Amino acid sequence: PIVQNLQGQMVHQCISPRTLNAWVKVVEEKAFSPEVIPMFSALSCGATPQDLNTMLNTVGGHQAAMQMLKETINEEAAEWDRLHPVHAGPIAPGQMREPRGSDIAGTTSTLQEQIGWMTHNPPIPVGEIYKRWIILGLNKIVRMYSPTSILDIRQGPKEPFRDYVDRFYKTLRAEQTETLLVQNANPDCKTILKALGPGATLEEMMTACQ
Amino acid sequence: PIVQNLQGQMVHQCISPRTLNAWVKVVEEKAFSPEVIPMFSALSCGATPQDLNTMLNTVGGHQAAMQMLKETINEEAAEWDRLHPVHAGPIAPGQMREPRGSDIAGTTSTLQEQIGWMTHNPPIPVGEIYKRWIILGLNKIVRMYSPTSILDIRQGPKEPFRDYVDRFYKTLRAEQTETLLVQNANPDCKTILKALGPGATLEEMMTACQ
């Protein structure tokens, strides 16, 4: 990644064994749950496109999701190429070239070209654009990998309200309320909630129904 | 490896216990799956040929793969010798010699000769050439170690489409599509997919067949 040294300059350091280790472990244990996206966003902080590529290639499962990510990255690279064309000819000697849509992904661009783009004034944050594309991929997979719809989440008769709210909101996060939450509740709890009315925080509902 | 110190100079530091530890653990747990190659590429970032040699020698299993790697490295060293001959005579005192094909592998070259080649302007990236040869070896082993062919991957009647796509693409990565993926699918899912037609992303197929 690109870090700030003790002297006071931004230098490229080599990825630690733990960014890779924790990344493989979170994708292995948590699959593609929503909270897995922030991990990637936090583990890859300051990472180069090459580093992001290492993280993506380290995973050994869910290859269909990886192809989703591939297609998303190609669509975004085509949109970058369309929005920001770049000239060809000869790269000027001792000079920094423009980043293509394929360059941001790290397919053509090399690591020295990458750190040239990052250590610039003003810097071209190719890592941040690549992170944006990878994240768009990840949100897309996570949204379409949800096990059940929000309509399916309904509270059981013997189930506590807390568990129902937890299930409801984990499903709501997976697919990215107020009125819907009461509709799925059983006649118990709903008896008091309908009497509560509008303007009550989630905690008022869960306290009255505790 | 060759790292950048806080002052702002490239110095050789001694390999950490974790590069070795994580390397042995990934080769032990994941064998030669494709994602094992990026680990080596990420764990050995900035590593000297001697460091790469330590990593290779740390593994205690799959010795036939190690001999594949040996033969690949000899072929590449012979090609380096053929492409870039070097003179003999006497090494000039206080001077840096040319890297042979055997030097890049670290068989004749010593660590001081290595860090002389890396800390040079322009530097001779013997570590990167050696990494290229080791990686060519690794891709070769991984491709020829695949359990089954892509033709074998077929979707079962009761198996979800997601699992079939996952198997198909893990096999495709192991041996380094569009039309083939539909052919191996059962009559179910294929019923809708044939109606979809060309121009649909992988996600369109997996959404319609969900």
């Binding site: 090459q50 590529n53 192809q67 591939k70 190609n74 690279a77 394929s102 992904a105 397919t107 | 569009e178």
Partner: peptide
């Protein structure tokens, strides 16, 4: 496309 099925991340056609 920048990426195609069957190759690792960061490799051209």
């Amino acid at each position: 496309p920048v990426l195609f099925p069957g190759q690792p991340f960061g490799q051209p056609p």
